[PDB]
Nucleic acid binder design. Structure first.
Ligand SMILES: [Zn+2]
Ligand SMILES: [Zn+2]
Ligand SMILES: [Zn+2]
Ligand SMILES: [Zn+2]
Ligand SMILES: [Zn+2]
Length: 169
DNA sequence: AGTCGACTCGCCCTCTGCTGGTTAAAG
DNA sequence: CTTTAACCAGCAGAGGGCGAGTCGACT
């Protein structure tokens, strides 16, 4: 109460050091979940976790329909009504509602040697991983009822094969 | 008393991934 | 001009790490 053997404390309180040890060095994780293999250092965390199974959203935006699992997602939602933009690219001074959005802007706009993503099925590369997501869903997803070639009778079940086939035509 | 350890409530940060407007090239 | 799909900010999903304030419990 307090000092740390393996870290640079971060006094002071008996738990403010014990729990620190629990988080950063002795990964205790006493409380465990119902269905998943989850367990973590605080019960507050598990109470929050169980809503991913249940679906409880006990925090309403008095101004819209939204409802969040915990308090912070609502304070973060509130910025959209207030118009507050707390975050700032230090290079261009663009403003953003959300920290991670800013980090992503910096990564795509002011960063070099950043890794891309190559589609496994087709040969095109795109920058954000999530856009590789929408590309795999729109271009290499299974189309159940099929699509017919525009100029011949051949039917295809994936949009890529369809567009590729539409040659030499 | 005086010190916990356990209980609880709250602040703020990170990583992840989908959605829809824009834009620019290819039909 | 239309059609298309990557680019981009916006925005919501889950989880981690800290501060700090009540008490009954035990020396
Ligand atoms: Zn430490
Ligand atoms: Zn669970
Ligand atoms: Zn709202
Ligand atoms: Zn910038
Ligand atoms: Zn054909």
């Amino acid at each position: 109460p307090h000092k740390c053997p393996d870290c640079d404390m971060a006094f002071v309180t008996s738990g403010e050091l014990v729990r620190h040890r629990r988080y950063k060095h002795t990964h205790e994780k006493p409380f465990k979940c119902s269905m998943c293999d989850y367990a973590s250092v605080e019960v507050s965390k598990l109470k929050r976790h169980i809503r991913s199974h249940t679906g409880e959203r006990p925090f309403q935006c008095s101004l819209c329909s939204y409802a969040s699992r915990d308090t912070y997602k609502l304070k973060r939602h509130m910025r959209t009504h207030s118009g507050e933009k707390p975050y700032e690219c230090y290079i261009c001074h663009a403003r953003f509602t959300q920290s991670g959005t800013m980090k992503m802007h910096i990564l795509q706009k002011h960063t070099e040697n950043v890794a891309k993503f190559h589609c496994p099925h087709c040969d095109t590369v795109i920058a954000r991983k999530s856009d590789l997501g929408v590309h795999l869903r729109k271009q290499h997803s299974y189309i159940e009822q099929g699509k017919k070639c525009r100029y011949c009778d051949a039917v295809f079940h994936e949009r890529y094969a369809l567009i590729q086939h539409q040659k030499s035509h």
